[PDB]
């Protein structure tokens, strides 16, 4: 156990940067390795079992790099791979399903939105009873196009959420990209608590790591980006989502 | 050369079905082998060289199934892989770039819409001079979500097409999915001639195969579907676009 | 923990059956999964980092079959992957390098033979001080061709072992196949103790698994064989070295 | 066609250098790209269909480097991939099976030796009627260990060619490596004509290439080596077999 060692964070691409941001705020002294698998993004439409192999390869790559814990920022990969991945690895492994589904248990009727893979996996029903679940394929490309406040978002939010229970008290945003869309989602489902996977998970990570004596007390934390697709494209994309990408290098899928 | 043998048509997923339909209308006596690489869709944001390897892998698989010709129904893969793929292979190879550009050469000011990869590839500039070109990433998810007749489609067309020159006489629909948004594109840009990649390629295919004595003068045509991801998801998506998918089988990326 | 779960054992091919037989004797009630990577055999000429990815891939595969412990029967793959693989996984992980090196420390001057990769790795010098090491590439094929009792084996043993120190007291048989060549090796190196990787490891596995309470207590144990190459070829090659294979199925490299 | 373009030659490893050497002696002004797939050597124990994907992949790679012709120096790979590879590609494609079988048709009772995959392909029987065929697995490592002049080479030659008919007039040396064993093979089978795949193929390539008007008339020939395994290990092994490797670099299997 070396608290000077970095924390691994991985995603299919830029969406998981919402998780990275929340982690860095609570843990400014830590070193993060953010792995964006942009050569194979998106996971949301791939067979769950293929994502599970992706997650295993990427966990292996992060351990090779020496991380002390792994945060699976993707909801699709969390659904596909956890809890087994945490049950198979020695370093702590954290996901974005359980923390938000835990908080959700203090409400009478809970709904879920996420990718096609996420809602069909049954990952969330394993931790919490769901009144309603619905795949929102367009949210991700709406967010990546920078249209989170544009009227089209709103109409699309209405198309996906029109048919949903009026007594829902909370809604799980079971996709890394969905925090950008609280505005259009709040507007169509007023009064409903919106559960953010990123903030809920980073808190869990911070609590658990300190509890194990693995947080780094001293020093000034940094972030390195590792992507399997084009780095310049990723840098552009990350910026459209308000993240200044400083350090990026391309990781070959042969290194996997 | 054996005219009883089938025609290979391949795409990243369901989009290339527009090409498949135009072909089946002109050549009802041909057997088609339609390959949808849904395990690795989309191509439009991947590195152009990676798509080139995809095209070569699938081209080889189709040659091992016995096809007498190959239609590359994806605009991204055509940009990535043609003309070399046709130069390197003995069977006739056709793409969806050159026929639409060729028709485009009979207007004075010509514009292009397509995927990210396509507009950046320079493939279309090779064949016709372009006044304006714009990637339309939301269009593909809009079509796959079944919303081409919804007013959000009308709004998205405006977000992408407003700031294109008023003196366009023609617009190249440089993506397999765009013939579905012909109404919305036509409304936001009245008067401009819309060039359909699928209709113009199918004609080029039929003309040339005829010229070579390769058409199958007798018998009833059949279509077989071959995909790399989940077949049942594929069939659902295909049916939302108007193809009743009769035969579908899953092909391993190990077979490539 | 679940003591009904099987034990995973993996190798590049049939060599690891020497380790499996030793395991069978000490643990007749245990259910075993033997994973033979015959699509990618042999490991001895490949880069150590490539083998290391193989070990990770297969370890992940065995975990998905539910194994409660993993034995790395290949000496080349132990050299590539241990001790990190054991440090990184929750289940007990055992190799064929450490146990023979432990026993070898009760000798004054010790030598090592094995594959090209094993000798270059420096895996063995990390556990025991070595007086001599020689790669013996032809020894593996001699065993698989069934020539271990034949004179040509004896001349080949002399060719590799001529310039070995006359005062050696022990020789590490650092390759799964080398137990078949004890006759020819002792003839060229009389009076030298031959340290058998397979016999020592099964004891360690048995001791360690007994201690963790993971030993199965009821039941007749079988072995299931999983291979990445042609199963019938594997079946025929295993029989030539004295193993009767009953259950063998081909596992695709894409499941990895 | 471009006559300044290089000729492509590929093999699993160093065995194909016998073919390269013969080629360079006949075509000293030609530029050659030698591709040795040392990350996946040997082919002889693999499923023939897997080798066939290898041939396709590497052929695509060489076409992307711009070769004007391809020589498949491996007898296993010719058996797996020819004649189809030659039918499906525009560049001239040459193998090592057909030329040696053609010369063999000038004899009454003809034998063949080679790898397990080569004799099991039945590729040689498509071109010449065979009286006798034997796989000789140990010949390849004998050559790679530098033991072709050693007496085990005489003993091993005798082991594999003992039941061979005494009325056999010719033997096809159906493996790239076996010309180094001409000495032992002729000694153990006196009076039998030995048909060398390498010398006969180069003749055919030079004949065919001049006829297509593709020879490069000006220039000093060089060879560049491309390997998928470790380049220094390859260079060492090429030096043991008498080839002086000037330029070698490693190509990733993901580039394939």
Swiss-Prot record, chains A, B, C, D:
Keyword Membrane attributed: no
Gene Ontology molecular function: glutamate racemase activity
Domain of life: Bacteria
Binding of substrate, residues: 11-12, 43-44, 75-76, 176-177
Catalytic activity: L-glutamate = D-glutamate
PANTHER family per record: GLUTAMATE RACEMASE
Similarity section: Belongs to the aspartate/glutamate racemases family.
Name under which the protein is recorded: Glutamate racemase
Source organism of the structure: Thermus thermophilus (strain ATCC 27634 / DSM 579 / HB8)
């Amino acid at each position: 156990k070396d608290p000077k060692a970095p924390i691994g964070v991985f995603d299919s691409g830029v969406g998981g940067l919402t998780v990275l941001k929340a982690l860095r705020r609570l843990l400014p002294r830590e070193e993060f390795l953010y792995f964006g698998d942009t050569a194979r993004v998106p996971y949301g439409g791939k067979p769950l079992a293929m994502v599970r192999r992706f997650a295993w390869e990427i966990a292996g790559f992060l351990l090779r790099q020496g991380v002390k814990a792994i945060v699976v920022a993707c909801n699709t990969a969390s659904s596909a791979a956890l809890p087994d991945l945490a049950e198979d690895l020695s370093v702590p492994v954290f996901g974005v399903v359980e923390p938000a589904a835990r908080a959700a248990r203090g409400f009478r009727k809970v709904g879920l939105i996420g990718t096609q893979a996420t809602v069909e996996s049954g990952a969330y029903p394993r931790y919490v009873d769901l009144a309603w679940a619905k795949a929102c394929p367009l949210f991700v490309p709406l967010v990546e196009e920078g249209l989170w406040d544009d009227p089209v978002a709103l109409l699309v939010a209405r198309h996906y959420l029109e048919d949903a229970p009026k007594d829902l008290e909370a809604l799980i945003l079971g996709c890394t990209h969905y925090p950008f869309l609280k505005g259009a989602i709040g507007a169509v489902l007023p009064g409903v608590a919106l559960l953010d996977s990123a903030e809920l998970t980073a808190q869990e990570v911070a609590r658990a790591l300190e509890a194990e004596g693995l947080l780094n007390p001293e020093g000034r934390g940094r972030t390195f980006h590792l992507v399997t697709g084009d780095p310049e494209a990723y840098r552009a994309l990350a910026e459209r989502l308000g993240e200044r990408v400083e350090a990026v290098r391309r990781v070959s899928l042969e290194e996997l």
